[PDB]
Design a protein around this nucleic acid. Structure first.
Length: 437
RNA sequence: GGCCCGGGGCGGUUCGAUUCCGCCCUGGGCCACCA
């Protein structure tokens, strides 16, 4: 086991097998034929076009080029019109920029419409850079596609591959830029060990400077941070993951991590051993795109958390999970129960103006003096973390995300103890509590 | 839909809020959905 040989075995895991390669070349064949019969202008881009797709993740990207004078409405209507007629079956479902997804002779296909520009300066469509990414990349990524696959397979197995809100990791393109830049999966991992939350990679300038935040400048648009959506924590995980790989090479870094089954009984005990408060906020999954759902779940989750903390329940961490029908806001706190009374800080005896206003108040225990300033004993409306959230989520739903907030408004419940380990969150909870094994 | 920056109106809470919890208007960036 020495990097070198480990990577040799790793290829097997990430290099598409000739059968899959065929299934793809054969679908591509079909796409064109279908497309030509229609006489539309198009270009094959993506990792399929550059032969850098992750073994087992064969998917074709076809971009329909339209004149930049066309309205956004035109692209959508005609683009979708084209896609529906060129696919075996389709599924129109996106968050902002319209496009069709489907299957052609067994393979996944993205039929994306976009304005064909010259120079990706003032992108008029969210996707306008893609065609140029392919031009810039096609001639440089030549011959290092397997180095790309190593890195992709690396990030994948470790849950930080996608760049969409559900992952907040490394986009496929980001990976190719990293390879062009560093030269190989090894060099990147090696150098990554030294990246900081300020590292700036400017591939176009063949340079690495320091900045205000992690930033990989797109060779095609110098104002574009390819790694814009890469979360801080995931950046940290990657770097740290690199340090361990280099410190102890194992091909277990390319194999999708432990499936994880565990017994709901073990959890009940790990929780009792922790003597903490573990509960979840349940509600109906808004029927909206993942790219809209997750950001909301992050917000709602945070809001609940920020509440729990200022309320002194001492929250530990939080996490969310979305089944197909429901969503869950998970939490663990140190205070299962707090006292009814508490200390509110009043003014300094010096200025009687406010002291009088402070003292003159329908109070149950009457304020005292401690270190030149008055204090008052107040009573809490709730004493447990649940009582508190039931109150918050019932009263502040409108702030828990547009859609998520509205589902909670119409229904939401809090689940504790035994009835909590029955729901589908054991994976997340264990993960949240750092239950090793 | 989410994040960031800024106008402008408010309710609540607090001895005391631009400054804490929130609500309406509104302007400008960026991000995810393709890459």
């Amino acid at each position: 086991m020495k990097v070198e040989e480990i990577l040799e075995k790793a290829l097997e895991l990430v290099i598409p097998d000739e059968e899959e390669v065929r299934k793809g070349r054969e679908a591509e064949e079909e796409l064109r034929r279908r497309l030509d019969e229609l006489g539309v202008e198009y270009v094959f881009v993506g990792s399929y076009a550059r032969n850098t797709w992750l073994k087992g993740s064969l998917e074709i990207d076809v971009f329909l080029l339209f004149p930049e004078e066309f309205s956004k409405e035109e692209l959508r209507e005609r683009g979708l019109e084209i896609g529906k007629a060129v696919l075996d079956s389709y599924e129109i479902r996106y968050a902002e920029h319209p496009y069709v997804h489907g299957v052609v002779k067994g393979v996944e296909v993205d039929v994306v419409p976009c304005y064909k520009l010259k120079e990706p300066k003032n992108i008029k469509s969210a996707v306008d850079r893609t065609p140029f990414h392919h031009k810039w990349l096609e001639g440089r990524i030549k011959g290092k596609e397997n180095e790309v696959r190593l890195l992709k397979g690396f990030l994948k197995a470790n849950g930080i591959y996608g760049a969409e809100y559900k992952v907040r990791g490394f986009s496929g393109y980001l990976c190719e830029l990293l390879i062009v830049f560093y030269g190989s999966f090894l060099e990147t991992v090696k150098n990554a060990r030294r990246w900081t939350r300020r590292t700036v990679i400017d591939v176009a300038k063949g340079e690495v400077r320091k900045g205000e935040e992690f930033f990989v400048v797109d060779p095609v648009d110098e104002k574009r941070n390819v790694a814009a959506n890469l979360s801080l924590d995931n950046l940290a995980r990657f770097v740290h993951l690199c340090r361990e790989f280099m410190e102890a090479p194992s091909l277990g870094f390319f194999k999708p991590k432990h499936p994880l089954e565990i017994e709901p009984e073990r959890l009940r005990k790990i929780v009792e051993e922790r003597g903490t408060a573990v509960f979840a906020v349940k509600f109906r999954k808004p029927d909206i795109v993942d790219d809209n759902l997750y950001p909301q779940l992050e917000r709602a989750s945070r809001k609940i958390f920020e509440f729990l903390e200022r309320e002194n329940f001492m929250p530990l961490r939080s996490a969310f999970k979305a089944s197909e029908e429901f969503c869950y806001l998970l939490f663990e706190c140190q205070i299962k129960e707090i006292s009814r009374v508490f200390r509110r800080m009043g003014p300094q005896f010096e200025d009687e103006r406010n002291v009088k206003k402070f003292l003159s108040r329908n109070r149950a225990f009457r304020p005292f003096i401690e270190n030149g300033r008055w204090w008052a004993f107040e009573m809490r409306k709730f004493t447990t973390p649940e009582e508190g959230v039931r109150s918050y989520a019932s009263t502040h739903w409108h702030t828990l995300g547009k859609n998520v907030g509205e589902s909670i408004r119409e229904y939401f419940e809090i689940i504790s103890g035994e009835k909590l380990f029955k729901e589908p969150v054991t994976a997340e909870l264990c993960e949240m509590m750092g239950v090793k094994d």
